[PDB]
Design a binder for this molecule. Structure first.
Ligand SMILES: [Mg+2]
Ligand SMILES: [Mg+2]
Ligand SMILES: [Mg+2]
Ligand SMILES: [Mg+2]
Ligand SMILES: [Mg+2]
Ligand SMILES: [Mg+2]
Ligand SMILES: [Mg+2]
Ligand SMILES: [Mg+2]
Ligand SMILES: [Mg+2]
Ligand SMILES: [Mg+2]
Ligand SMILES: [Mg+2]
Ligand SMILES: [Mg+2]
Ligand SMILES: [Mg+2]
Ligand SMILES: [Mg+2]
Ligand SMILES: [Mg+2]
Ligand SMILES: [Mg+2]
Ligand SMILES: [Mg+2]
Ligand SMILES: [Mg+2]
Ligand SMILES: [Mg+2]
Ligand SMILES: [Mg+2]
Lengths: 142, 187, 258
RNA sequence: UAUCUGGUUGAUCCUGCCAGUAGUCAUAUGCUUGUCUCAAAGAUUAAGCCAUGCAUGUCUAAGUAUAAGCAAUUUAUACAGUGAAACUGCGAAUGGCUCAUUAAAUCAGUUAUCGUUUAUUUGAUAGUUCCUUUACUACAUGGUAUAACUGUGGUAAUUCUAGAGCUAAUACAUGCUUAAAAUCUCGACCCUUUGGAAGAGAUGUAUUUAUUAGAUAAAAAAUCAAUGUCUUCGGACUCUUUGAUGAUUCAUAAUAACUUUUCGAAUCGCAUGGCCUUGUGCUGGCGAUGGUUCAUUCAAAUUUCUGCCCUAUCAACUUUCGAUGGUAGGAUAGUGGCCUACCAUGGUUUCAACGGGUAACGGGGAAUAAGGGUUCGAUUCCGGAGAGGGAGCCUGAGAAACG
RNA sequence: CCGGUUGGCCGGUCGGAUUUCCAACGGGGCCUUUCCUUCUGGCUAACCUUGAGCUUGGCGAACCAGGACUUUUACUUUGAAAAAAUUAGAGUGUUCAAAGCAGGCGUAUUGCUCGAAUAUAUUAGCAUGGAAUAAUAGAAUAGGACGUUUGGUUCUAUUUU
RNA sequence: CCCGUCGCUAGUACCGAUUGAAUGGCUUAGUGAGGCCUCAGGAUCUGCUUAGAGAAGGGGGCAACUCCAUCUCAGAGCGGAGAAUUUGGACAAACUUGGUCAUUUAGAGGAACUAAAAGUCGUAACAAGGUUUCCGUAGGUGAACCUGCGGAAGGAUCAUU
């Protein structure tokens, strides 16, 4: 959020070409889409300047499959957070339950700002990395 | 040989996996192309389901597109000047995708003369009507036209030579040209 | 492993074929065709186990090679050709015409039809798209591709297919008050009118359905096949008419006729 | 089918174990053994080692036949019946066997491919190639081989094959023959503004890259910059096109090029008609095989959620040699540290990570149970893995294949 | 107020059931301070209407469609999608039975015909009704809810001139 | 009321000084087969471009001179397919020299425990067991055990307004 152009390659959206001949307002062509399933595309994606190839709104991924909910327990990666899904597991012999949990690494777009303690909902995508298969679609706590 | 699987790596917890399975063929990997310049030499690779794949080794020319002008010409490649993954590819003159190269630029100047009638750098009535009608589009940019004086244009390789065999690209323009120009002129 | 399987053990075959668990280790594996191998009926089990016109697979092959049976008007001298839902089967010796429709017990019925009715079949459209050179097409439930369809035909409709040509005679849309056939699931074989459909964006649209005795049920949209408006169907329904009497009413009805 | 009983004392009541008692698709063993039906069967120890034989080959009217094969003709001096070999094409990746490995692995139920390959089947689907396009030619049809065969041989020996002489194709290499119109791009020249053309070239599909479209919640006015086939030249300006999905840069279309240039039938069997200015003229049926692309089917490869035995006399593990993520590339059928270059310092864990053990393939399931449970599941079905141990690969749609 | 099941009722045929009926159990509609949200259209559902008692001109789920605002769970009900075999179980004299999925009935010559049910199958995922019991959130240096206001910044964007 | 030392027989595990050999998972350094990709290489085979030179047959001579020629010598060429061999690379079986751990054997000797045993010396406990017993800790002793210090009653005292 201090520069866009940090890497050695030119960061740009693929096949979105801004014609150097013309001169208008609305400075650059920015491609964005709605991810579907009633998730609202955030204004920071529509108006921003970040590139973020793995974004569910401006980038080349699609949300399909499970929609999950967790609480952010780690933000120390770059564009990646770890959420914690807590559930109760039933044991039939003793006729009662026990607390269990899983950690899910999810990708977070620069449209969203999360801290530790926020509740997020994530949507399944194709494999992003070795462990990441989920992508943040709405941050709605603090 | 080269395997493309994830069972040989550690788990996310960090444990060492046991050998579940011998290396399967549907997860194979193949050696790189390392496409050099000159004297075109295309080998074939038989891949999954038939479905031939063209390893270009040592490609010479390419089809390069001028995007603001909406054309494309078959132009000779001079050499790679920048690569964001590795400097040894720039030194060894390997052609991959996203390689910044220099191309010949003489078909582009021939098209620009034949289309607009003004020369870059420094007879019939029908051609006069055509050249007058598309006026106020013969002022392209400063950076590209100075390259046209120098006879070498900066292009970016958009094709994958080890996969298709072809080395296609587009001429660098605008802010992307300024970015790679600051990269190139950086000491 | 290592490639496609070519055998099919008995006790792995679909249960609605009614193949007895003794008399052989293998079942007739349906060859690749217009229908999925679970929701299909090979001609060997139709000719031998349902019509009793043969005693062996060898006799079924002997029937098939003299080009007697033809399915949807084409000859098909294959032993394990998958005949599926709404296929017509013509036996020109005996001049017989069958349509594969389910009885309410969930099995394929021996539904004898007349010669006028054997001239067509219904198909549920599975996708409408634009092929090459911008030509639209539909794909019916048995994989027939029909070019230049009507623009009003969207998915989950039924089109009437001519079976001498591959042309479309007319079509039934999808809304409330339409007579449906359930092909798939627990309620396989039942006929009822659709009351309403549930949007469920993200997977598995449900549809609520009530038969003539006002018994409602619900089914996924994958298993529903619209067959007309309420009152007239576009085909002849088998005996029973898809009513699903309970077992109490069924032994009462059996003790009537016994 | 909700059951107990004998044994500590000189006697008693208890704790408590031992012993009995019933079953076992639990094995073994002893003694005994008439009949009918039905039936498991080298799992446990040694996924130890193997003499012998067999277990994968295949032909139709419909790829190739001059067997110096066999038949009988009488259609037929080119062939035409049956049929060895051999070439070509498919198949040999299924089945069958076993349970060593393997503890978030396999597996089970439930998802996804908007992240990909798919022989076959089934349904659709290809007037564009005379590559310099007045013949440079074959399109009433073009070139080589080579096998079997014939003959000469080598080696102790093998499903070893060498030199020589023949000859085919639905093998291998090569190559043409069909409507038009329409639209773009160059344009001789008539001319000049209001400008027109005659002509030539290009436009199938596949490959690759760049660019463009793929829209859309409901109504009126203002100078203006060019106005728009006719204009009351201030018009009514509509009628001007737009499929799907929850969602796409999707389907599909267009433009400019690319290609080392993919495919676009030199194939086979029966029937042998139709119409003629009567030439061996033009035309025409039902098939068979092949073929590009899409869909379908049989599949595959990855993948989401949750669920696994004992052990802390295992408390910290992973990370120069990828450990967790970012950016580019490479490779792959495709996604991804899958690999490389550079960068950041992450990722798991008392809710038991990591290690160790398993006389551990997982599941459907089995035995025994009032209810709750406990023990087992090598083994008739489903999934996985392996072929003495490892590793590597060819062919092919499909193998890291073991007949 | 209203219908839903089990009754109950002249035992109507001498163990069959026409409901004016007592009763119990289980739902729904409305009012009582009771918001248990509704921005655009066709269609009007009830419906203003209404013909002398089938008429021409009122409230959108009554029927859908389009977008917009959504405290978050655990629990329980119903249902979908859960492979056969095996388990429980229905029918059927394998001569009985273990089994099997067969079979039965005629003028047995042209034949006719009933079947191959059903239930269970956890935990997880999915759709749905309930909202007791356990949690969770909210208006407190108001930054609160409203709002026909009275306005100003700022962003699209149609049909039109 | 049959056991504390010492003693006999049998069995079971432990510690073993022992620089003994045998396995195996890893691991340190050095080599590293094979195929595959790649840089070359070019045995051979073949197709077309010249036509100088060498035996017979047409158009002028019907007497050196101009076109096809059966075939080579080959140079004024362009290729193509391609075998051995060979360079780098990734994959990587294996090999040699260590070093760790998970497994066996031998083993001078110990060191206990259990059972069975008509042994030896005492009498520690059970009665106020003849010095009440037991606990923790320290020292001592042929053996039970003894003694110091603090504790307990499971004591031989529920008790002295
Ligand atoms: Mg078959
Ligand atoms: Mg005692
Ligand atoms: Mg006694
Ligand atoms: Mg006992
Ligand atoms: Mg198999
Ligand atoms: Mg086809
Ligand atoms: Mg990548
Ligand atoms: Mg990366
Ligand atoms: Mg094992
Ligand atoms: Mg075993
Ligand atoms: Mg198996
Ligand atoms: Mg295998
Ligand atoms: Mg063996
Ligand atoms: Mg092998
Ligand atoms: Mg074998
Ligand atoms: Mg004594
Ligand atoms: Mg004493
Ligand atoms: Mg004493
Ligand atoms: Mg004493
Ligand atoms: Mg005492």
């Amino acid at each position: 959020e201090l520069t866009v152009q940090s890497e050695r390659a030119f960061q740009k959206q693929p096949h979105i070409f801004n014609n150097p001949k013309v001169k208008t307002s609305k400075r650059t062509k920015r491609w964005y889409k709605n991810a579907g399933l009633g998730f609202k595309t955030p204004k920071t994606a529509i108006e921003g300047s970040y590139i973020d190839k793995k974004c569910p709104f401006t980038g080349l991924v699609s949300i399909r499959g499970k929609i999950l909910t967790g609480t952010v327990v780690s933000t120390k990666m770059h564009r990646t957070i770890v959420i914690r899904r807590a559930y109760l597991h039933y044991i039939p012999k003793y006729n009662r339950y026990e607390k269990r949990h899983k950690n899910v690494p999810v990708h977070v777009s620069p449209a969203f700002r999360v801290q530790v303690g926020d509740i997020v909902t994530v949507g399944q995508c194709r494999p992003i990395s070795k462990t990441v298969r989920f992508n943040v679609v709405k941050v709605s706590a603090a | 040989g080269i395997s493309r699987d994830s069972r040989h790596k550690r788990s996310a917890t960090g444990a060492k996996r046991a050998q579940f399975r011998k290396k399967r063929k549907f997860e194979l990997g193949r050696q790189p192309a390392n496409t050099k310049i000159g004297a075109k030499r295309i080998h074939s690779v038989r891949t999954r389901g038939g479905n031939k794949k063209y390893r270009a080794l040592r490609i010479e020319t390419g089809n390069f597109s001028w995007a603001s002008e909406g054309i494309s010409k078959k132009t000779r490649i001079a050499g790679v000047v920048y690569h964001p993954s590795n400097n040894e590819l720039v030194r060894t003159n390997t052609l991959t995708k996203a390689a910044i190269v220099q191309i010949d630029a003489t078909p582009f100047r021939q098209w620009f003369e034949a289309h607009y009638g003004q020369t870059l750098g420094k007879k019939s009535k029908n051609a006069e009507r055509k050249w007058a009608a598309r006026a106020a589009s013969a002022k392209i940019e400063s950076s590209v036209e100075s390259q046209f004086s120098a006879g070498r244009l900066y292009a970016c390789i958009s094709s994958r030579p080890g996969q298709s065999g072809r080395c296609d690209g587009y001429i660098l323009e605008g802010e992307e040209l300024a970015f790679y120009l600051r990269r190139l002129t950086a000491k | 492993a290592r490639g496609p399987k070519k055998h099919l053990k008995r006790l792995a075959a679909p249960h609605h074929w009614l193949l007895d668990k003794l008399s052989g280790c293998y079942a007739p594996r349906p060859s690749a065709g217009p229908h999925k191998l679970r929701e299909s009926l090979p001609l060997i089990v139709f000719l031998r186990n349902r019509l009793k016109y043969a005693l062996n697979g060898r006799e079924v092959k002997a029937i098939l090679m003299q080009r007697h049976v033809k399915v949807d008007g084409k000859v098909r001298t294959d032993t394990t050709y998958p005949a599926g839902f709404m296929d017509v089967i013509t036996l020109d010796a005996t001049n017989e015409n069958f349509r594969l429709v389910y009885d309410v017990k969930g099995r394929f019925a021996v539904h004898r039809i007349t010669d006028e009715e054997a001239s067509y079949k219904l198909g549920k459209v599975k996708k409408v798209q634009l092929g090459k050179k911008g030509v639209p097409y539909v794909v019916t439930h048995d994989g027939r591709t029909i070019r230049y369809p009507d623009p009003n035909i969207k998915v989950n409709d039924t089109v009437k297919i001519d079976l001498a040509s591959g042309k479309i005679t007319d079509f039934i849309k999808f809304d409330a008050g339409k007579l449906v056939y359930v092909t798939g699931g627990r309620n396989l074989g039942r006929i009822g009118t659709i009351v309403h459909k549930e949007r469920h964006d993200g997977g598995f649209d449900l549809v609520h359905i009530k038969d003539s005795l006002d018994n409602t049920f619900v089914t996924r949209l994958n298993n529903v096949f619209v067959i007309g408006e309420q009152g007239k169907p576009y085909i002849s329904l088998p005996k029973g008419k898809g009513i699903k009497l309970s077992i109490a009413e069924e032994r009462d009805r059996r003790r009537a006729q016994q």
